[PDB]
Write a protein that binds this ligand. Structure first.
Ligand SMILES: *[C@@H]1O[C@H](CO)[C@@H](O[C@@H]2O[C@H](CO)[C@@H](O)[C@H](O)[C@H]2NC(C)=O)[C@H](O)[C@H]1NC(C)=O
Ligand SMILES: *[C@@H]1O[C@H](CO)[C@@H](O[C@@H]2O[C@H](CO)[C@@H](O)[C@H](O)[C@H]2NC(C)=O)[C@H](O)[C@H]1NC(C)=O
Ligand SMILES: *[C@@H]1O[C@H](CO)[C@@H](O[C@@H]2O[C@H](CO)[C@@H](O)[C@H](O)[C@H]2NC(C)=O)[C@H](O)[C@H]1NC(C)=O
Ligand SMILES: *[C@@H]1O[C@H](CO)[C@@H](O[C@@H]2O[C@H](CO)[C@@H](O)[C@H](O)[C@H]2NC(C)=O)[C@H](O)[C@H]1NC(C)=O
Ligand SMILES: *[C@@H]1O[C@H](CO)[C@@H](O[C@@H]2O[C@H](CO)[C@@H](O)[C@H](O)[C@H]2NC(C)=O)[C@H](O)[C@H]1NC(C)=O
Ligand SMILES: *[C@@H]1O[C@H](CO)[C@@H](O[C@@H]2O[C@H](CO)[C@@H](O)[C@H](O)[C@H]2NC(C)=O)[C@H](O)[C@H]1NC(C)=O
Ligand SMILES: *[C@@H]1O[C@H](CO)[C@@H](O)[C@H](O)[C@H]1NC(C)=O
Ligand SMILES: *[C@@H]1O[C@H](CO)[C@@H](O)[C@H](O)[C@H]1NC(C)=O
Ligand SMILES: *[C@@H]1O[C@H](CO)[C@@H](O)[C@H](O)[C@H]1NC(C)=O
Ligand SMILES: *[C@@H]1O[C@H](CO)[C@@H](O)[C@H](O)[C@H]1NC(C)=O
Ligand SMILES: *[C@@H]1O[C@H](CO)[C@@H](O)[C@H](O)[C@H]1NC(C)=O
Ligand SMILES: *[C@@H]1O[C@H](CO)[C@@H](O)[C@H](O)[C@H]1NC(C)=O
Ligand SMILES: *[C@@H]1O[C@H](CO)[C@@H](O)[C@H](O)[C@H]1NC(C)=O
Ligand SMILES: *[C@@H]1O[C@H](CO)[C@@H](O)[C@H](O)[C@H]1NC(C)=O
Ligand SMILES: *[C@@H]1O[C@H](CO)[C@@H](O)[C@H](O)[C@H]1NC(C)=O
Lengths: 427, 384, 198, 49
């Protein structure tokens, strides 16, 4: 079939119509990023020759072609701890949560650490660890940070975020109640903070239910980890290609180098072994070039994950579609094998009403404009309201500022503007 | 470390210098325990040899031979060998050997070569392009030159029993016009039970200790053990992905030996600067300490660094949460790295901390922008 | 050691040039690595069998330099595009982006040049010398719930004030500092204090 | 010259293909670069080298 690009939508535009959302949905859009890859290391002489002095005395004729591969793979291997360090170690203290979890109704129990485990991962980090899954001179080195140290850094970032908001990104963590942190975060997206307090149980239930759906996604759908399982697969496919190229002949009588040396005298054997050295060195240079280009692709992803950590976790982002989808509230980091996972909390506006609107209002000749928000009418009365949540208010000299007169403005409308100082005198 | 770096000064760090390998204690040699001597005298001293259209084929099996007796003989006008060297044959062995036997003109000996051009070569006796074995020949002008007019000529290794019939003319008065007897030894290097072998005696077998073994010609260095590898009755070897043999049936006791390359791993040398101390510690990567002031890390066995119960910032990174440093009367120490000071934030549902003051910080951030604009004349570099 | 990145970029390019130069001394299976030894000793029929080993080796050894210089140039280009982005957002502006323009809240940055690089002196406001306060999300008055326009409500223990989020500076709670919405029954943790009417 | 980036990304990928195509004509040390002018001239044992 010809692919659909999406459902078609004529937006209901006209020069005096505005749609304002009367309600919202808090959403948790997961995002998954590679951060590191398997720290392979190779003895280029044990791969190419392997326990033959008769071959090593030929491989020395190629000079630094061997030792610069060890140099290049060491460059990648030491860098994977730099990538892991810059992504997770963005906090100089290990913060820990209080004994009582009085977070205003929000239920972090599925993302905070679980004491029931030998490595103290959180519940959602255990789902993420489940979904991701030699004698030939090749070796695999351990990461500097163990998965238990990674899980302490994600707990420090998360216990910081929950107890202190963005403030631990600047100085030492300043405690603030979580019901007041979300009211800062609502002002950050231009939603008046009383829209949190007057809906706090609803906002808590929507966050808690969205955290519920993350566990169902990650339990049911192994392809959620697709970007991390891809990096684990490529670094295994490249090692198996490199190991298979030991069995290739390259034009020698055999690929088993001991079955050259047991069969052939040194006059003949030096012709055959140099075909295997030429072939295996070209195979190792191919692997190291693939790994250098592939490591630069993971480094770009680690620098992106470190930027997501700095701006989405340690702060709140104005950058559209950077931290999730919707207007950004906050993000929680979770570790995964060779990567990081961000649970981006976002305000998505949800239930529109259509209103008649105007750019300005005439009172007695003066044109009044809104300080915060827009003018709207239900069809009979004019109100002013904030851009991102329908909350209609009487149009007043407190909500509005004057400039000029009626003549200048295309589409101005007539209404009274109320001035509270008048009945304050006249009562 | 100084020879890895090509330097007489080394900075504080960890360097992957070298590889630790357990060495072979002794060389262990195994062959089929069979003692019949091969019939090569029946091949090389026969009274008559076939015409080159007809060429008989001895099969040699179940026996022992010395090839150096042929290689040092003054009898032979050629001894050209392919895929094996005539000096090596006594150290090596085979499942079958065949001897093709026939008479030719001396002008045609080079037609008895792998893939070579010629009338004898195409019609009646092509050696395969992928031969393995030896061509041995001698002038037979003392025996075949009666004259004699009998010996006759017209896919590889195919017999071929106007006329399709043409024969040589040999008189004792004839060097290239003389008769020659040619023998071609073809060697069956199957991955299967050997039956024709060199004169070399077998040793006793050794287990668990590292040895430079040879089974039937399979030379290699490794620890040998008994195994859970349930070979089927016809199987002689097993292999790894890298084509390297990974188990063998012993050719005398017929048990299924494991092969493991003797205990080995990369060596990292952990050092403060030589600009501070010449004391160093060594990490044997990926090994238990049992084959190598000694401390098993999950990265490997670490030697010459004291395990310290405290935790500090990571000075030299080792791996798997372990770091090392040079500290207090001073030595290298190894420790589990500290992630930072630990802090319970004083949270409660009605408490806020507000800063009463500030500090204007100035932080230097350094970024590369442009590396050196090198350029290389590839013609002058390659050709000078 | 504060210059560590720039000195590393100098050292990598110097080490790559030195390695490419040393590879002229490698034999690659020819009788000598000094090309004039082959050309003086061997006639120009035998010699081509030897010289083609040096051409095969030195060509492969130049491609190994140029491939790593292309990958290393992409790593420097990724840093130059980041440095140009810091110059634009961080010197020519002020950044809302947390930890982009140094640790703290960003004020301004001053660029300084350095060999093969740039150095930014990021100036940041870091908050300090905390006090703990009791706090509330709103204030009840005539049953109306009042919320702060700028900043937060705080108490020293006996009195209620409003203050900006990032510097303690207490102000009397007034109808100029606060806005009404709804009534007391709706808000979890609302507290009672008079709100002064100027 | 305003479209210079898109036009140069089109140029680089076309020059890289022409370079790869031209290298079929290079000898690399063989008697000829035309593979059939080896196989039609040398018997299939001498030709292999
Ligand atoms: C916070 O949410 C978690 C689940 O996300 C709640 O814990 C679960 O509670 C149900 C019963 O409601 C049990 O069947 C599960 O076994 C619990 N799971 C775990 C991992 O404990 C938790 O009770 C909620 N907290 C509050 C204060 O309501
Ligand atoms: C805003 O939308 C939410 C749903 O996203 C509404 O909350 C639901 O309200 C119905 C009854 O109207 C209940 O059955 C559901 O259990 C509620 N869900 C939750 C998560 O609490 C909410 O009522 C809407 N508010 C307005 C003003 O329209
Ligand atoms: C537009 O909104 C206003 C205010 O909610 C509505 O005006 C009120 O209408 C009710 C009867 O429906 C009266 O009891 C109130 O006294 C009215 N208030 C004022 C300030 O006059 C108005 O009806 C709405 N119009 C539409 C078309 O829905
Ligand atoms: C807003 O109201 C004023 C009157 O209060 C309207 O002004 C009148 O407009 C008509 C038609 O142009 C004139 O004949 C009158 O002389 C005007 N009166 C005055 C006092 O100037 C004005 O047109 C209204 N504007 C809108 C957009 O409805
Ligand atoms: C809380 O702050 C208020 C105002 O800063 C303090 O009240 C003042 O206290 C001084 C004496 O210490 C009096 O001279 C003022 O007249 C008081 N002002 C008012 C409005 O009553 C109060 O003492 C502080 N409380 C604490 C515990 O520090
Ligand atoms: C805030 O002030 C109101 C009165 O303005 C308090 O309301 C009284 O509460 C008690 C105990 O629940 C009732 O017996 C009274 O009848 C209430 N009086 C009125 C006029 O409603 C309220 O309790 C105070 N809240 C806090 C948190 O101190
Ligand atoms: C707004 O009104 C128009 C009237 O034609 C309608 O097409 C549109 O679907 C309405 N939009 C919403 C969000 O109700
Ligand atoms: C809006 O459009 C209508 C015609 O569709 C026109 O009559 C009216 O004057 C326009 N008003 C403005 C403010 O553009
Ligand atoms: C062939 O016979 C002669 C004696 O007639 C003997 O010297 C020689 O060693 C024999 N060669 C072989 C291969 O048996
Ligand atoms: C080989 O010889 C040993 C004694 O040296 C004997 O025990 C063994 O059974 C023999 N094996 C075969 C296959 O004949
Ligand atoms: C390095 O060693 C020299 C002496 O060889 C000494 O003068 C210098 O101060 C040392 N530097 C450091 C940083 O220890
Ligand atoms: C090391 O080997 C010994 C037995 O040789 C064993 O007791 C010990 O548990 C091993 N430790 C590790 C980490 O392999
Ligand atoms: C480290 O401390 C533990 C107890 O916390 C003790 O069992 C162990 O022996 C100590 N090890 C060293 C080397 O001090
Ligand atoms: C704030 O008060 C709590 C009371 O338990 C205390 O633990 C904490 O150290 C105080 N913080 C500051 C910065 O004064
Ligand atoms: C804060 O928690 C205490 C119990 O720890 C409770 O008495 C009080 O009502 C709570 N207030 C809010 C704002 O949640």
């Amino acid at each position: 079939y010809t692919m659909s690009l999406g459902a078609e939508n004529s937006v209901a535009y006209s020069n005096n119509s505005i749609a304002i959302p009367t309600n919202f949905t808090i959403s948790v859009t997961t995002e998954i990023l590679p951060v590191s890859m398997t720290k392979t290391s190779v003895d280029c002489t044990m791969y190419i020759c392997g326990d033959s002095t008769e071959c090593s005395n030929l491989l020395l004729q190629y000079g630094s072609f061997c030792t610069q591969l060890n140099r290049a793979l060491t460059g990648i291997a030491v860098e994977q701890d730099k990538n892991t360090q810059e992504v997770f170690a963005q906090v100089k203290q290990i913060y820990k949560t209080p004994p009582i979890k009085d977070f205003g109704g929000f239920n972090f129990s599925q993302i905070l650490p679980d004491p029931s485990k030998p490595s103290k991962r959180s519940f959602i980090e255990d789902l993420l660890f489940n979904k991701v899954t030699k004698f030939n001179g090749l070796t695999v080195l351990p990461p500097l940070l163990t998965d238990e140290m990674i899980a302490q850094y994600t707990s420090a970032l998360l216990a910081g975020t929950i107890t202190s908001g963005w403030t631990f990104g600047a100085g030492a963590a300043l405690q603030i109640p979580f019901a007041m942190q979300m009211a800062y975060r609502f002002n950050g997206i231009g939603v008046t903070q009383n829209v949190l307090y007057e809906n706090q149980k609803l906002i808590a239930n929507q966050f808690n239910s969205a955290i519920g759906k993350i566990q169902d996604s990650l339990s049911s759908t192994a392809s959620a980890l697709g970007k991390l399982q891809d990096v684990v697969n490529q670094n295994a496919q490249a090692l198996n290609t490199l190991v298979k190229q030991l069995s290739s002949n390259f034009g020698a009588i055999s690929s088993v180098l001991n079955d050259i040396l047991s069969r052939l005298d040194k006059v003949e054997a030096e012709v055959q072994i140099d075909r295997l050295i030429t072939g295996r060195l070209q195979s190792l240079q191919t692997y190291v070039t693939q790994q250098l280009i592939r490591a630069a692709e993971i480094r770009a992803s680690a620098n992106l994950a470190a930027t997501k950590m700095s701006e989405c976790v340690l702060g709140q982002s104005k950058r559209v579609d950077f931290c999730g989808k919707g207007y950004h509230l906050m993000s929680f980091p979770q570790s995964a094998p060779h990567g990081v996972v961000f649970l981006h909390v976002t305000y998505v506006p949800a239930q529109e009403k259509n209103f008649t609107t105007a750019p300005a209002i005439c009172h007695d000749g003066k044109a009044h404009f809104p300080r915060e928000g827009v003018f709207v009418s239900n069809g009979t009365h004019w109100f002013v309201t904030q851009r991102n949540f329908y909350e209609p208010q009487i149009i007043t000299t407190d909500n509005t500022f004057v400039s000029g007169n009626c003549d200048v403005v295309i589409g101005i409308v007539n209404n009274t503007v109320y001035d509270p100082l008048q009945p304050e005198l006249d009562s | 470390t100084k020879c890895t770096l090509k330097s007489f000064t080394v900075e504080k760090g960890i360097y992957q210098t070298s590889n630790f390998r357990v060495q072979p204690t002794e060389s262990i040699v195994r062959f089929p325990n069979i003692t019949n001597l091969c019939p090569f005298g029946e091949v090389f001293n026969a009274t008559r040899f076939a015409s080159v259209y007809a060429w008989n084929r001895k099969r040699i099996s179940n026996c022992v031979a010395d090839y150096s007796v042929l290689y040092n003989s003054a009898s032979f006008s050629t001894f050209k060998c392919y895929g094996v060297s005539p000096t090596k044959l006594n150290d090596l062995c085979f499942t079958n050997v065949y001897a093709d036997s026939f008479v030719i003109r001396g002008d045609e000996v080079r037609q008895i070569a792998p893939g070579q051009t010629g009338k004898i070569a195409d019609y009646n006796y092509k050696l395969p392009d992928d031969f393995t074995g030896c061509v041995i020949a001698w002038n037979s002008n003392n025996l075949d030159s009666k004259g004699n007019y009998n010996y006759l000529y017209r896919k590889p290794f195919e017999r071929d029993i106007y006329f399709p019939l043409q024969s040589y003319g040999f008189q004792p008065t004839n060097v290239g016009y003389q008769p020659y007897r040619v023998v071609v030894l073809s060697f069956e290097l199957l991955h299967a039970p050997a039956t024709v072998c060199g004169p070399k005696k077998s040793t006793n077998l050794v287990k668990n200790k590292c040895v430079n073994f040879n089974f039937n010609g399979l030379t290699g260095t490794g620890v040998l053990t008994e195994s859970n590898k349930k070979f089927l009755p016809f199987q002689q070897f097993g292999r790894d992905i890298a084509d390297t043999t990974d188990a063998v049936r012993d050719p005398q006791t017929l048990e299924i030996l494991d092969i493991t390359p003797c205990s080995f791993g990369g060596v990292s040398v952990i050092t403060p600067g030589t600009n501070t101390s010449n004391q160093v510690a060594v990490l044997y990567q990926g090994v238990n300490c049992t084959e190598v002031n000694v401390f098993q890390t999950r990265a490997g066995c670490l030697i010459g660094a004291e395990h310290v119960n405290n935790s500090y910032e990571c000075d030299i990174p080792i791996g798997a949460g372990i770091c090392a440093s040079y500290q207090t009367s001073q030595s290298i120490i190894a420790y589990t790295m500290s992630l930072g000071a630990e802090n319970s934030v004083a949270y409660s549902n009605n408490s806020i901390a507000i800063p009463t003051n500030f500090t204007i910080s100035v932080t230097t951030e350094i970024l590369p922008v442009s590396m050196t604009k090198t350029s290389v004349d590839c013609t002058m570099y390659i050709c000078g």
